[PDB]
DNA sequence: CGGCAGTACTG
DNA sequence: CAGTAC
DNA sequence: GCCG
């Protein structure tokens, strides 16, 4: 696996500092570089050998900094606000600009957020389940959640099928997220069961809190009935059968996977989002793009000129 | 240099 | 409009 | 942050 973890560690700390400080691109380059250093077959030996890794000049300059020295000195200049901002980012619905606001307001602890800090409804639901949301769950409990949502959905219409796309479907032992995709094979009967099932599950108590409540997209908190059960974040999306193959890809993950798939689709003049695979829109543009039917996940790998990758092989 | 995904919700 | 989310 |  990671043959250069002594450097990937210190760089993941640097990338975290950038991610916590609004520099999404600095963090994205760092993460793509750690994801490349962790997947490389042999450990690094020189600067030349480091830069040839698809790693730049200043990144391999840090690789060589940790290869010749034992501690990267960039880390010594990291701002002391980085931990506080990261802590505020650990709250749901709270990112770099809200952590920055809380920080300049003199807040330096979660208790300060729960006492004097102004919170939104979502930032409150995140602040109350702070520990649970950071404790990823075993695959078995995610399966319990999946089957529970599927059974309750099938009671409204037995034709409906469900799938727990996400790190679970990728085969990851832990999952601090549960995204259940529900659809109907005909693509027309699905319309109208979202609210009924959502109220059903909240009535029984499967759902504890609600975050983003849209017509087609549900985001909230669930908790399996039983002792010592921690609150897990669940999303329930009811998209038509036509778009199911384009949705199941994105909601399977990872993000970096759908980022490389989106780049590859863009080079071949195609837009690959979580709703449909369309080709290049007319060009300022003088027209939208043309949808390409892709019923199965292989059809999407096909129209993109790529071999089918198993969900297990989607960490990119 | 300049692009790195586009989207819906919430406020 | 922006912020945070997938 | 890297790379076309
Ligand atoms: Ca996830
Ligand atoms: Na966060
Ligand atoms: Na339980």
Residue numbers in the entry: 250 to 303, 305 to 464, 470 to 538, 543 to 575
Quote the original article.
Biochemical assays, site-directed mutagenesis, and X-ray structures of mutants of human Polλ incorporating sequence determinants from P. tetraurelia PolX or metazoan Polβ are used to investigate the origin of their fidelity. These constructs also included the following mutations to facilitate crystallization and diffraction: Δ1–241, KGET, and C543A. Because we could not crystallize P. tetraurelia PolX itself with various DNA substrates, we set out to crystallize mutants of human Polλ incorporating sequence determinants from P. tetraurelia PolX or metazoan Polβ: these structures indicate that a Loop3-based fidelity mechanism is incompatible with the fidelity determinants of Polβ, which is based on a large conformational change (open-to-close transition).
The Polλxt-R construct contains the I492R mutation that involves the position equivalent to Polβ’s R258 residue, and the Polλxt-R-SD2β mutant has an additional mutation giving it the SD2 motif of Polβ (NEY). When this mutant was further engineered to include the SD2 motif of Polβ (NEY), enzymatic activity was nearly abolished (10-fold lower kobs), despite an almost normal KM in the millimolar range. While the other constructs (including Polλxt obtained by Jamsen et al.) crystallized in the P212121 space group with one molecule per asymmetric unit, this specific mutant crystallized in the H32 space group with two molecules in the asymmetric unit, displaying highly anisotropic diffraction data, resulting in two very similar structures that differ only in their respective Loop3. Both molecules exhibit a closed conformation, an absence of incoming nucleotide in the active site, and R492 positioned between catalytic D429 and the NEY SD2 motif (∼3.5–4 Å apart), suggesting stabilization via salt bridges. In these structures, Loop3 fails to engage with the DNA template strand, which is improperly positioned for catalysis, with missing density for four and two residues in the two molecules of the asymmetric unit. In the Polλxt-R-SD2β mutant, where H530 is replaced with tyrosine, this interaction is lost. Only seven residues remain interacting with the DNA, insufficient for stabilization, causing the templating nucleotide to be mispositioned and preventing proper stabilization of the incoming nucleotide.
